[PDB]
Enzyme design. Structure first.
Site, PDB file in Angstrom:
ATOM      1  N   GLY A   2     -99.883  16.342  96.105  1.00  0.00           N
ATOM      2  CA  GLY A   2    -101.134  16.958  95.849  1.00  0.00           C
ATOM      3  C   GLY A   2    -101.099  18.134  94.476  1.00  0.00           C
ATOM      4  O   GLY A   2    -102.172  18.005  93.721  1.00  0.00           O
ATOM      5  N   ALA A  61     -95.372  18.337  96.754  1.00  0.00           N
ATOM      6  CA  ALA A  61     -95.936  18.518  95.336  1.00  0.00           C
ATOM      7  C   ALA A  61     -96.939  17.025  94.870  1.00  0.00           C
ATOM      8  O   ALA A  61     -97.188  17.103  93.890  1.00  0.00           O
ATOM      9  CB  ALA A  61     -94.955  18.771  94.456  1.00  0.00           C
TER      10      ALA A  61
END
Ligand SMILES: Nc1ncnc2c1ncn2[C@@H]1O[C@H](COP(=O)(O)OP(=O)(O)O)[C@@H](O)[C@H]1O
Ligand SMILES: Nc1ncnc2c1ncn2[C@@H]1O[C@H](COP(=O)(O)OP(=O)(O)O)[C@@H](O)[C@H]1O
Ligand SMILES: OC[C@H]1O[C@H](O)[C@H](O)[C@@H]1O
Ligand SMILES: OC[C@H]1O[C@H](O)[C@H](O)[C@@H]1O
Ligand code: ALF
Ligand code: ALF
Ligand SMILES: [Mg+2]
Ligand SMILES: [Mg+2]
Lengths: 305, 307
Positions: free
Chosen positions: A251, A249
């Site tokens: 990104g 997560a």
């Protein structure tokens, strides 16, 4: 600030930290196991909500217990969940995740209800998308649906932000409708055929996307930050240094926080800085949504810098 | 009537199975075509195979004090298994296994031990009499080695047959191997234990000799669809399995083990016993999930009396 609409997936993550990935016919025993809410769509919606955005989420869960559970949670994350549908007779998406000692991971996905987010459900949100300032999507929802939503946003001057993940090739028809695309290195290479090892590779990969019609290209480089490029003019914006524990997560947090910053009218470089801060905090925590930081935390991090 | 009593000591897992085309690679994300949550764990799978095929079996294991644990214990009781020896570990969750199965039907497994790690030598000692009075003890390697060792010693001192399915693959101390009467490694496990890669009825025999010299009289190396290389103190005979369309081979080996011991305890000669086991396993490979694919005795004999 303007309104944000996130359209994407909702997953229940099953995470097993282990030493090495189990080769075929083999079995490995982990050291830590965690069941947490995931799904790129939901992760990005939570990052937006927690960072302070006015966001609504178009998504689908199953008519199961975990689905009711995730919807209740999402509502507490400053997310308007009115657009989140419950699919009768379908289960909520699930993600099986392996993390080795090197922090790299392998993700297996059960789409479940996510495969039901159809063009029809998108058309039902036409007005919501047309009135939004921006639309943020990923690739864990049916392409036809992402395409449909992109067209509505385009027809209505709604900014189209696309996080091309998981990696895959995309038709020029879709790319032409994107204003902001956020591939990581593997995704950039998969979309342009150009491998990204250095800032020079990034610029060449970005040029391909600019030619496909995408004005703002942001190629995330992991701990190296991101190569930000606006119609050919770009540079690498370094991220922050931290001891990573879990980059799942990372990104997604970057995307949610980025759009929040942009919608508050902060110039691109500043917005990327805001996004890097949120992401940095996220990588020092475990799980997808559990590791997503709140606005207070983000600004604090920024002020202590 | 009733054959000798069997005691299975091992793990209990809740399996999360995702069928996909190709296993994903590092940093990769793949969408599968089928997801299933079912009961697993080599210990439980083998206990169910034994129970369903007709054995008089009791199961020594541990579940967590969670809902899934109570659920699996109730299920096991309906599989003709005496679950009195199954402990509920307070403050611990039941074992979990995350599983990927590609287009060819192969699989990779990641395990969260959970309560299984609590099956200690102390819990084994509490079953001393049960093990001592049993005709056979069947174990795998998803339980603490110290516990498997302790159980093996009790069985040994009491002439209780020790059957060990050396899975998951790993090296084992000579001290343990010396106490085994029947070992059932697959090819990867044979190689891991003897250092000899098994690829044909020449290598199997060589891998088997190494185990015989470690003190194991009966060595059965499963060869997947090629059946098994059966060897009793150097005298090896290959026993072909049956041909069927595989859909899921998870628990194929576990079914083989559970059915094998049931057949042996009914005093069926080894070759026949292996055939009985191949039949049960064959049926198992044509179904999905671990325990859900384990066949019953009626089904096993039917399959046999039709061949
Ligand atoms: N090791 C790290 N240290 C600090 N920040 C990181 C690190 N890795 C990733 N990030 C942050 O999260 C963003 C996304 O990283 P990246 O790995 O490219 O994306 P994704 O999570 O989709 O693979 C980066 O641009 C950065 O802001
Ligand atoms: N493709 C198959 N067709 C028929 N029987 C099979 C097949 N695969 C496995 N089996 C049965 O299960 C047994 C063990 O299979 P094997 O792959 O060697 O072990 P494991 O499942 O532990 O890796 C075999 O001896 C056989 O009876
Ligand atoms: O990007 C991370 C996310 O991808 C997958 O969808 C998992 O659910 C995880 O939460
Ligand atoms: O042998 C198959 C079994 O191995 C692992 O224990 C999984 O739980 C699965 O049920
Ligand atoms: F759609 Al563009 F530059 F973002 F043509
Ligand atoms: F214990 Al042996 F041959 F099986 F010595
Ligand atoms: Mg994290
Ligand atoms: Mg099967």
């Amino acid at each position: 600030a303007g309104s944000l609409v996130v359209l994407g997936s909702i997953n229940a993550d099953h995470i097993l930290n282990l030493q090495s990935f189990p080769t075929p016919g083999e079995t490995v025993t982990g050291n830590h196991y965690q069941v947490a809410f995931g799904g790129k769509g939901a992760n990005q919606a939570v990052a937006a909500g927690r960072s302070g955005a006015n966001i609504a989420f178009i998504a689908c869960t199953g008519d199961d217990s975990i689905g009711e559970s995730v919807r209740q949670q999402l509502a507490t994350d400053n997310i308007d969940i009115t657009p989140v549908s419950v699919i009768k007779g379908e289960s909520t998406g699930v993600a099986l995740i392996f993390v080795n000692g090197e922090g790299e991971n392998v993700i297996g996905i059960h789409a479940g209800a996510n495969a039901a987010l159809s063009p029809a459900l998108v058309e039902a949100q036409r007005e919501r998308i047309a009135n939004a300032s921006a639309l943020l999507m990923q690739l864990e929802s049916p392409l036809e649906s992402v395409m449909a939503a992109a067209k509505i946003a385009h027809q209505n001057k709604t900014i189209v932000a696309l996080n091309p993940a998981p990696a895959r090739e995309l038709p020029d028809e879709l790319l032409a409708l994107v204003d902001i695309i956020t591939p990581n290195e593997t995704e950039a290479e998969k979309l342009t055929g150009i491998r990204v090892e250095n800032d020079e590779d990034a610029a060449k990969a970005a040029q391909v996307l600019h030619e496909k019609g995408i004005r703002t290209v942001l190629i995330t480089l992991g701990s190296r930050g991101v190569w930000a490029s606006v119609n050919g003019e770009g540079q690498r914006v370094p991220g922050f240094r931290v001891q990573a524990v879990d980059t799942i997560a990372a990104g997604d947090t970057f995307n949610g926080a980025l759009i929040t910053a942009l919608l508050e009218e902060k110039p691109l470089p500043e917005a990327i800085r805001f996004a890097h801060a949120a992401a940095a905090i996220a990588v020092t925590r475990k799980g997808a949504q559990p590791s997503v930081p709140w606005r207070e935390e983000i600004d604090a991090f920024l002020d202590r810098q």
